[PDB]
Amino acid sequence: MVGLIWAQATSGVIGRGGDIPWRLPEDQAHFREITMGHTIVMGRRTWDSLPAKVRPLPGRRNVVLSRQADFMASGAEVVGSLEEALTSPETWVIGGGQVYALALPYATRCEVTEVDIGLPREAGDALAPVLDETWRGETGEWRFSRSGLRYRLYSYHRS
Ligand SMILES: NC(=O)c1ccc[n+]([C@@H]2O[C@H](COP(=O)([O-])OP(=O)(O)OC[C@H]3O[C@@H](n4cnc5c(N)ncnc54)[C@H](OP(=O)(O)O)[C@@H]3O)[C@@H](O)[C@H]2O)c1
Numbered sequence: 001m002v003g004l005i006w007a008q009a010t011s012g013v014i015g016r017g018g019d020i021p022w023r024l025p026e027d028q029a030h031f032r033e034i035t036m037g038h039t040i041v042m043g044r045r046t047w048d049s050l051p052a053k054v055r056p057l058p059g060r061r062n063v064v065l066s067r068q069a070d071f072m073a074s075g076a077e078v079v080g081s082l083e084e085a086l087t088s089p090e091t092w093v094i095g096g097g098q099v100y101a102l103a104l105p106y107a108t109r110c111e112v113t114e115v116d117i118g119l120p121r122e123a124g125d126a127l128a129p130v131l132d133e134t135w136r137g138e139t140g141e142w143r144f145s146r147s148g149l150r151y152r153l154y155s156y157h158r159s
């Protein structure tokens with residue numbers, strides 16, 4: 001099983017300026033529950049975005065995709081291709097925009113947090129991947145985050 005997990009604004013923006021323009025503790029807890037114990041695969045830019053104290057995320061095989069053969073991600077594996085990372089029962093791709101697009105052919109699950117923030121797309125933004133007609137979706141109810149933004153979970157799946 002390869003799954004993708006991400007949070008997006010209603011516009012599809014998932015990242016700006018190398019970070020994320022919101023922070024929902026509830027979504028972080030959801031992310032932790034879904035990924036805990038499994039492989040997590042991330043692009044090098046997303047690894048860069050994690051603070052050194054939080055890196056690697058605990059209890060998970062942290063894998064970083066990079067074309068730099070000498071890139072060092074202390075506490076993580078650095079691989080040059082996505083296929084190298086797929087050696088575990090569950091693999092969660094945790095971003096960013098480039099790696100979501102790269103991993104989508106391998107994917108049968110997408111756990112998507114829609115954040116009710118009106119965030120027009122700007123040049124340089126990272127965006128959520130486009131899901132074609134093979135994906136079947138199940139939508140949760142809108143919830144209030146303590147941060148003040150509403151959010152809802154979509155669970156997309158396909159054979
Ligand atoms: N849920 C969310 O909202 C969420 C989750 C994660 C990240 N983000 C955001 O997403 C943004 C980063 O996304 P990004 O798209 O800019 O970069 P990214 O996908 O995180 O990492 C891009 C890097 O991955 C490596 N890479 C990409 N394709 C590769 C391939 N085919 N083979 C080998 N290595 C490859 C390269 O690393 P080298 O340059 O080292 O070769 C490339 O520079 C940040 O803003 C981050 O905060 C958002």
Ligand SMILES: [Co+2]
Nearest residue numbers: 033034035036
């Ligand atoms: Co699990």
